Design a binder for this molecule. Structure first.
Ligand SMILES: *[C@@H]1O[C@H](CO)[C@@H](O)[C@H](O)[C@H]1NC(C)=O
Ligand SMILES: *[C@@H]1O[C@H](CO)[C@@H](O)[C@H](O)[C@H]1NC(C)=O
Ligand SMILES: *[C@@H]1O[C@H](CO)[C@@H](O)[C@H](O)[C@H]1NC(C)=O
Ligand SMILES: *[C@@H]1O[C@H](CO)[C@@H](O)[C@H](O)[C@H]1NC(C)=O
Ligand SMILES: [Cl-]
Ligand SMILES: [Cl-]
Ligand SMILES: [Zn+2]
Ligand SMILES: [Zn+2]
Ligand SMILES: [Zn+2]
Ligand SMILES: [Zn+2]
Ligand SMILES: [Zn+2]
Ligand SMILES: [Zn+2]
Ligand SMILES: [Zn+2]
Ligand SMILES: [Zn+2]
Lengths: 376, 376
């Protein structure tokens, strides 16, 4: 069986932090820690009495001089488990039911003959950032793939979920074709947000605590705005219409042509700079150049626009379209466009009724993956 | 897949003729024919008893008043199969092994999904002339390209062999940039004689029957001198050195500065006029202005000069340099010069050991073409 590398989406692998901060926002917050602690996912840190401490540690500071993000002073954040699977099978070190992520898929692979950290390996990353600030991650990923090719006697299958598809596409578009032809067997794409997702507007405007409801919406908005990866997934012109209204107020309508004014009207102009930094990272029409399987969910009510009666501090009324609940269905059209652009096969597989996160543990998803890896 | 137009080199497509001649050079020659007959390639016409009849029909008459060529009186020559492929896949209507030309490439294209005369079409022409006398051909080529763009939903890839590269470069240099940006996807150049070939001197001086050995060398020289395209491919100053000696006699040495004296010393002053007519057709330093793939053969002994002990009626001693057997390797330098001169990519691809004619049917050549048309 071919070696496998797993690339998670946003919030899709653990993060750890160590503190030696010059100041704290509240006298209850720790200034300095003995060693690293799990900052995601750790329910203990999200209680209302100390939720402000967690925000001050997991947010990113944007630097206009360098056009890059920085951790807050004295805070280090590292990504554990690179080349392994534990930080990616469960999001909470206690391994709760809520935080079960890649575990079901990893367990299937091991059942088929794989060995964790050997011929199946995870490629976690700091999903708060866009690819332009994870240069070292992609170098590490290339070396891991070359290593796995040598050890297990064949090219590697890349399995990416959610935002990880955009990380993997960025990686593949920038490797030479001869390298991909030698080292990559296939690219299995699970719920890829090609061209952005409409819910990104709501995330920036008023926050979205859907995946971690213990955090108040205005508190998580502080962290979600500071993450470059949020603005990176704003809707793109090569998928959406420039006339499409994503945010509607009694006064103004915001299309994808109005991101500059949108960021100014929500009091977060740094978002516009991060959109500038990230809008051109993924080439609009360049295919990955490897055999591709695009698996996408349909039949799940998916937010396509938002109406605010009180903008932007009150939850909006959501208007729903088709998709997997997160990724709008029109994103799958991008996969179909790559057929004419590359020789390698591009297979599209609709998953009716399969939700964005739940497709990772779905038996139909795993059945498709099994045919790719083990053959007929 | 992108539409494809095939442009042949010299001798690279069939020619047909119809006769209503006022006189014949010999009483065995036909004066008037019922319909058109194949004049190239037709081995029946080349037997020694009637070889003079064929010369009198396929030669061109140069007219000093008009600075143009004319068919002999009462002879019409037409180019069959424009927009199709039959006149260009095989040079002999019997389809001999010798005359198989574009057939292998066309067969590959059809294997990849193309359809003869539909999204792959030939652009044959009267290769006896230089571009200044094929004005209507280039008009027909532009209309065919615009038609193919509309019918098949994309810009066209031009695939040219041998002299056809100079025809295609002449065409592209003279189309507006906005037109090429819309209608041309890429230009694949196979064995292009950028800047002339040294063997042209030998052709004019004493004839060269290498591609059709049944014709005596002094007889074919009559036809090759009368063809404007011969003088058009004399070595050019922007490739060769002005001090390079192409023809050596016990008395005189001929460089590219001596073409007028050369044409006088071989008793063919009309050639000097045809060189004047054609020396400025292709601009020396103007790039094609489209994405370009320059495929050139190396490692094949290529005539670079000639020594005559008896000038110019006896076969010379040949001195060999590097190239594809016909095109000297320094011609590929012209393609490398165009990188700095245009925005579109200029790719250079050496073909070690690939002969001028044989690269058209070579699997490595077709493999390169496949990636251009179908993508990675
Ligand atoms: C931003 O980066 C610049 C250049 O690295 C550095 O001088 C400056 O200290 C940084 N800004 C902050 C707030 O750290
Ligand atoms: C798993 O995916 C299949 C195919 O999309 C879908 O029919 C089924 O409802 C999903 N399973 C669950 C539990 O949603
Ligand atoms: C050459 O062209 C001139 C002008 O077109 C014409 O008058 C003359 O007849 C032509 N010469 C021959 C030999 O046909
Ligand atoms: C075909 O081209 C390849 C690459 O240039 C060359 O190595 C090989 O010798 C050629 N094949 C023949 C039959 O000449
Ligand atoms: Cl494939
Ligand atoms: Cl280009
Ligand atoms: Zn996602
Ligand atoms: Zn609407
Ligand atoms: Zn609506
Ligand atoms: Zn709607
Ligand atoms: Zn040639
Ligand atoms: Zn010499
Ligand atoms: Zn020599
Ligand atoms: Zn020499």
């Amino acid at each position: 069986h071919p070696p496998v590398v797993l690339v998670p989406g946003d919030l899709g692998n653990q993060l750890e932090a160590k503190l030696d901060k010059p100041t704290v926002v509240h006298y209850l917050c720790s200034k300095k820690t003995e060693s690293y602690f799990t900052i995601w996912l750790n329910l203990e840190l999200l209680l209302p009495v100390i939720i402000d401490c967690w925000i001050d540690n997991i947010r990113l500071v944007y630097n206009k001089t360098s056009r890059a993000t920085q951790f807050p002073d004295g805070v280090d954040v590292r990504v554990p488990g690179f080349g392994k699977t534990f930080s990616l099978e469960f999001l909470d070190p206690s391994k709760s039911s809520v935080g079960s992520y890649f575990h079901t898929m990893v367990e299937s692979l091991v059942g088929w003959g794989y060995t964790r950290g050997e011929d199946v390996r995870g490629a976690p990353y700091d999903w708060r950032r866009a690819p332009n600030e994870n240069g070292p991650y992609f170098l590490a990923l290339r070396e891991m793939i070359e290593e796995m090719y040598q050890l297990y006697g064949g090219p590697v299958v890349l399995v990416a979920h959610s935002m990880g598809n955009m990380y993997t596409l960025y990686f593949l578009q920038r490797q030479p074709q001869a390298w991909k032809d030698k080292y990559i067997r296939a690219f299995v794409s699970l719920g890829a947000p090609w061209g952005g997702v409409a819910k990104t507007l709501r995330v920036l405007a008023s926050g979205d605590n859907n995946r971690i409801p213990v955090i108040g919406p205005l508190k998580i908005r502080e962290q979600q705005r500071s993450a470059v990866s949020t603005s990176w997934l704003l809707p793109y012109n090569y998928t959406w219409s420039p006339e499409k209204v994503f945010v509607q107020t009694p006064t103004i309508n915001y299309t994808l042509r109005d991101y500059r004014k949108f960021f100014q009207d929500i009091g977060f102009e740094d978002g516009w700079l991060m959109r500038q930094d990230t809008e051109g990272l993924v080439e609009a029409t360049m295919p990955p150049g490897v055999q591709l399987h695009c698996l996408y969910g349909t039949g799940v009510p998916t937010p396509d626009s938002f109406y605010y009666e009180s903008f932007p501090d009150r939850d909006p009324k959501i208007c729903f379209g088709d998709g997997d609940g997160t990724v709008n269905l029109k994103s799958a059209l991008q996969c179909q466009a790559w057929q004419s652009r590359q020789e390698h096969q591009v297979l599209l597989q609709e998953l009716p009724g399969s939700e964005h996160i739940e497709m990772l543990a779905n038996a139909t998803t795993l059945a498709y993956l099994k045919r790719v890896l083990l053959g007929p």
